[PDB]
Amino acid sequence: SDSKAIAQVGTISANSDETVGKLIAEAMDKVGKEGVITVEDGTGLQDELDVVEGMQFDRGYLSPYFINKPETGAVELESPFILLADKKISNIREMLPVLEAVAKAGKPLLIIAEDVEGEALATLVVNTMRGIVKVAA
């Protein structure tokens, strides 16, 4: 149960490599008991441990224009309103109520669904631009 012992088995398993058990022990000590752990090939020659905090997934933004502060496509919608759907939004752009409802509150907005066409994005770009509604999906 202690991190020590755990480091010992990892180590022993990895043909006596302390670095391993050490690392592993750490990971477990972090992600927890039901925390997930996976191994991939590293860039450098040193072993490296990355730990995701909170909620996150493998999806990038469709509206590259909607980058908040930092680069690399970094968006940082401060105090947003998350939105979830079950379909794409080509010209189904109809929904401005919901939209304008926040343009009202003046809070950033995050979106999720089957997808989103430029029709929505386009307008979305200049809205968030003009300072109408800081958003992206």
Partner: protein, 97 residues
């Protein structure tokens, strides 16, 4: 040079296509649509149907009106500006107040 409609025929000019204001604050981008409103510029005498008399048109020059952009409507370049030509028939209503 300016024009002169041919009775029944009315010369108008559309307006702003999908003006960014819908939804209130929402700056509605042009999602591949057009405008139906326009202004009265020229008025044909009046329809000449049924021989007996030639009925005047219910639209005074300059009126703000809503129309059905259909086939009967055409386009021309007057003084290098877009203009529309349909019959009073095509004109649906009028914007007031």
């Amino acid at each position: 040079m300016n024009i002169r409609p041919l009775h029944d025929r009315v010369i108008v000019k559309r307006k702003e296509v999908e003006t960014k204001s819908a939804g209130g604050i929402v700056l509605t981008g042009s999602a591949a649509a057009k405008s139906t409103r326009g202004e009265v510029l020229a008025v044909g005498n009046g329809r000449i149907l049924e021989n007996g008399e030639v009925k005047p048109l219910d639209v005074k020059v300059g009126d703000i009106v809503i129309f059905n952009d259909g086939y009967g409507v055409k386009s021309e370049k007057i003084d290098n500006e877009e203009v529309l030509i349909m019959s009073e028939s095509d004109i649906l209503a009028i914007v007031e107040a």
